[PDB]
C-alpha cells in the first residue's frame, strides 16, 4: 500500500477546500479528507501555490511577519486550538530548515526564488510520504525521492517559478 499522499497525486496532503486546477470530481469513493488530483504535476503545483499564499501574507496570528521558514511552516502545519499540548510544528520547521540548509528564523527566505521553493516543496513531499524504499520503490536521486526532477520542475513551472538555466 502506497502512502495516502502518493495514492492521491496530492503529496502535500492538502485538505479539501479550494478547487485547485486538476482536481478529480468528488464522489462517494473520494478520500474523505484530502484532495485527489488527475496528475502529480497538479498536486505539486497546488502545494507551491499554497506556500506562496502564506509567504505573501504580511503577518501571522502571533502578530509576527511571515518571512521565515518557521513562520511559513507554522501556517502549513498549524497546532490544534485545544487538546493535548504537542510540538509537531517545531519539529516540522526544523526538518524543513535542514533541507534548505538555512536557520528557521533567517529573514532572507525568498519563496519567489525557484531553488528555495523547490527545496521546500521537495522537503514537504519527503516528510509527508516517507521513503519510497519502504514501499519497495527505487527513490529518484533528489530531495523528494517520490517524483522525477522533471515532474517537480513541471509542477513549479505551472506555479509560475522561473529556474535560471544555461
Ligand atoms: Cl534549483
Numbering used by the authors: 4 to 169
Question: Would you copy out the relevant sentences from the publication that reported this structure?
Answer:
Further experimentation revealed that a truncated variant of the ORF39 protein containing only the conserved PHA02564 domain can be readily produced in a soluble form and without adverse effects to the cells. This C-terminal deletion variant of the protein, ORF39ΔC, was therefore used for the subsequent studies. During subsequent crystal soaking and co-crystallization experiments with substrate analogs a different crystal form was discovered that diffracted to 1.6 Å. No electron density corresponding to the bound substrate could be identified in this structure, but due to the higher resolution and better resolved protein loops it was selected for reporting here. The crystallographic asymmetric unit contains two protein molecules which are represented as chains A and B in the final model. The two molecules have an interface area of 591 Å2 which due to its small size likely does not represent a biologically relevant assembly. Apart from three N-terminal residues that were poorly structured, the A monomer could otherwise be modeled without gaps whereas the model of the B monomer does not include residues 83–89 due to disorder. The overall structure of the ORF39 EAD is all-helical and consists of six α helices (α1 to α6) and a single one-turn 310 helix in-between α5 and α6. The structure can be regarded as two overlapping helical bundles, the first of which is formed by α2, α3, α4 and α5 in a roughly antiparallel arrangement, and the second consisting of α2, α5 and α6 with α2 and α6 running parallel to each other. The overall shape of the EAD is roughly globular with a large groove between loops connecting α1–α2 and α3–α4 and centered on the C-terminal end of helix α3. The Glu131 in the ORF39 EAD corresponds to the catalytic glutamate residues in the superimposed TM0633, gp144 and MltC proteins which suggests that the groove is indeed the active site of the Enc34 endolysin.
Hafnia phage Enc34 encodes an unusual endolysin with an N-terminal enzymatically active domain and a C-terminal transmembrane domain. The catalytic domain of the endolysin belongs to the conserved protein family PHA02564 which has no recognizable sequence similarity to other known endolysin types. The crystal structure of the catalytic domain of the Enc34 endolysin shows a distinctive all-helical architecture that distantly resembles the α-lobe of the lysozyme fold. Conserved catalytically important residues suggest a shared evolutionary history between the Enc34 endolysin and GH73 and GH23 family glycoside hydrolases and propose a molecular signature for substrate cleavage for a large group of peptidoglycan-degrading enzymes.
